[PDB]
């Protein structure tokens, strides 16, 4: 509900913004205009701490002493089945850290959220997306009112920037995993009070490689060559974990290509490679062909002949996914199966290989069974099982799971009884902009621009998505006047 995006275009005498944003927000988070544009990705900025309290004598232990809770008696109303409401009491207990919650297992936890004193989130975004210059953009960003997100920026003057943005507490010790778990709630040692300014955070501007990127990876290869390393920052800002195969593809697609056109940029975004197959099939196939089971041999020959792309017509891709579920977990992020582990020294070519081929063939054996049960056969076309269905529009799917290496993402659901599955998460608003004069931009919204019952604008873009047939985005008045189908005059009197 909360995550649904909406596309819009605003024009006044003093500003212009085009793009997508979460419904209910009065500013456009994914915005561009004739001068500039930004986008966002989740960085998981650790902006809160959960403290384990030690309860003692009706208070909590803190620096050797029992300390009483701040307590207030509040209440809220709860609607009953018969349409009335009843008054329910609610105690709000609080420690120095913040408000206290009790987990089902009895753990008393106090949550401390940073940046509760930052009222200007909406205005900061607003000033960012209507900035007259990069310096103005940066001064807005530097206010620290937007508590999270990677944020990427480009403009018609030629500047690009990546910022690992958010409001991060200053701490004197502890790495990210420590501050992500339950931190001890019995000592002022772990009670932070200040937060980092913008120039303490990983950022990159106009780097020698001529691009920036982020695909939810930790911020240590935002560009290539890199301009910093993890030791340049406090160890609690971001993980030092293996980069996903999608994120590896992100770096490669940008770094290895040059003399880019908007057209080629768009084509690169559609990348749907089974990178994990590149890392595993060289060891897996010969090991599997040794197996006496003729079904495993046949499975191995089907995988070997596959071009390793998640296309609609792929007969091997479903089977490969089912193998990967076992070899790398249900999220495809597990590392224990590989022979050569991930390394930041080879960040787009590790991990690699199959550590234990014999065990992996056993995983293939099980995956064959799983595949036939889910989909009816080991060689069902990928796009016959994977469909994009909104109202009465039913179109073939392509691309897939990010952790298998697909850049363009469709997190396919578990299949229904007929083996049909649809995206639960993935491509929504997709736009590509060139900051020429005038700007040129194309985009699509997977699930349309409206969700009101009976609208003709819920399912009217998904067929175009199935063919990567992008809409030209219309910012110039004359383009808008040529395309208009409805005019709503309004007037606002405060």
């Amino acid at each position: 509900d909360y995550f649904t995006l909406y596309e819009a275009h605003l024009v006044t005498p003093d500003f212009e913004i085009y793009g997508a944003t979460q419904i209910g927000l009065p500013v456009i988070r994914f915005a561009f205009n004739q001068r500039m544009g930004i986008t966002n990705t989740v960085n998981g900025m650790v902006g809160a701490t959960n403290y384990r309290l030690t309860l003692q004598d009706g208070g909590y232990l803190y620096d050797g002493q029992v300390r009483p809770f701040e307590r207030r008696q509040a209440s809220y109303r709860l609607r009953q089945a018969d349409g009335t409401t009843v008054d329910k009491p609610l105690e709000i207990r609080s420690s120095v850290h913040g408000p206290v919650f009790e987990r089902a297992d009895g753990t008393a936890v106090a949550v401390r959220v940073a940046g509760l004193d930052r009222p200007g989130m909406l205005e900061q975004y607003f000033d960012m997306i209507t900035a007259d210059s990069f310096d103005d953009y940066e001064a807005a960003l530097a206010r620290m009112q937007v508590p999270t997100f990677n944020i990427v920026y480009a403009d018609r003057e030629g500047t690009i920037n990546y910022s690992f943005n958010g409001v991060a507490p200053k701490r004197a010790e502890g790495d990210i995993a420590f501050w992500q778990g339950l931190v001890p709630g019995d000592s002022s040692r772990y009670l932070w009070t200040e937060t980092h300014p913008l120039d303490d955070l990983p950022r990159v501007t106009n780097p020698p490689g001529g691009f920036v990127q982020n695909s939810n990876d930790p911020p240590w290869t935002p560009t290539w060559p890199v301009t910093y390393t993890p030791k340049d920052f406090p160890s609690y800002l971001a993980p030092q974990t293996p980069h996903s195969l999608r994120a590896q593809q992100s770096v490669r697609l940008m770094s290895e290509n040059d003399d880019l056109t908007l057209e080629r940029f768009m084509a690169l975004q559609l990348s749907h490679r089974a990178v994990m197959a590149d890392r595993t099939l060289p060891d897996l196939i010969p090991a599997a062909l040794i197996d006496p089971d003729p079904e495993v041999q046949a499975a191995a020959r089907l995988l070997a002949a596959w071009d390793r792309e998640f296309t609609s017509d792929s007969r091997a891709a479903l089977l490969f996914e089912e193998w990967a579920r076992l070899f790398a977990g249900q999220n495809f992020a597990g590392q224990a199966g590989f022979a050569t582990p991930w390394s930041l020294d080879k960040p787009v070519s590790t991990p690699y290989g199959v550590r234990d081929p014999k065990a992996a063939v056993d995983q293939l054996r099980t995956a064959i069974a799983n595949t036939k049960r889910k989909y009816g056969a080991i060689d069902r076309p990928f796009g016959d099982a994977s469909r994009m269905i909104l109202n009465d529009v039913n179109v073939p799917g392509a691309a897939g799971y990010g952790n298998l290496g697909s850049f363009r993402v469709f997190t396919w659901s578990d299949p229904d009884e007929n083996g049909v599955r649809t995206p639960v998460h993935g491509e929504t608003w997709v736009a590509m902009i060139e900051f020429s004069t005038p700007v040129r931009a194309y985009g699509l919204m997977s699930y349309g621009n409206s969700r009101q019952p009976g609208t003709t604008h819920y399912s009217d873009q998904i067929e175009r998505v199935s063919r990567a047939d992008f809409r030209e985005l219309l910012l110039r008045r004359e383009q808008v006047e040529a395309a208009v189908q409805e005019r709503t005059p309004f007037n606002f009197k405060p």
């Binding site: 004739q34 809220y76 936890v109 009222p119 200007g120 018609r156 349309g448 309004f490 606002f492």
Partner: protein
């Protein structure tokens, strides 16, 4: 150096909607554009917007019963509704007027098109500038940054479609 194309200067307030239901909102000043934007959003996503604003008031349990209760406890315990009132008062006067206009656009869409608002979210109306601030606050700080799941020791993401 080459300047950008001449900016368009709106002379009247209007939404030009294209064939995919994208609103092109022209305002003679900022508050007008924000009003148009709220009207549009109400038209395209009104019901779920009203539900979300209702929740961010801490009134989910009151409006819609037990399925909304744990979110209500999370938000009231974290003081979200009152903090939003403070952030709203703490806005710069000019941006506050933009937020007020946005909310007024929602209210106006609903008032002019009451058939399009689902019965059980009607009780949310009217919405205010502070509701707009509150929803943003709950989204950023109390879904993205601090989720109920990570504090309460639960797990799987939201589940209401």
């Amino acid at each position: 150096p080459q300047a950008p194309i001449a900016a368009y200067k709106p002379r009247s307030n209007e939404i030009l909607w294209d064939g995919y239901g994208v609103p092109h909102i022209y305002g003679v000043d900022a508050p007008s554009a924000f009003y148009g934007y709220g009207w549009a959003q109400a038209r395209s996503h009104g019901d779920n917007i009203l539900r979300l604003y209702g929740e961010a008031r801490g009134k989910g349990a009151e409006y819609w019963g037990p399925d909304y209760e744990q979110t209500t406890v999370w938000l009231l315990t974290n003081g979200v509704p009152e903090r939003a009132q403070q952030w709203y008062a703490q806005q710069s006067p000019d941006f506050r007027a933009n937020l007020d206009a946005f909310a007024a656009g929602i209210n106006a869409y609903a008032q002019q098109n009451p058939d399009d608002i689902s019965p059980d979210v009607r009780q949310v109306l009217p919405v205010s500038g502070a509701d707009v601030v509150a929803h943003a606050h709950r989204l950023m700080n109390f879904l993205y940054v601090a989720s109920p799941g990570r504090t309460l020791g639960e797990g799987d993401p939201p589940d209401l479609a």
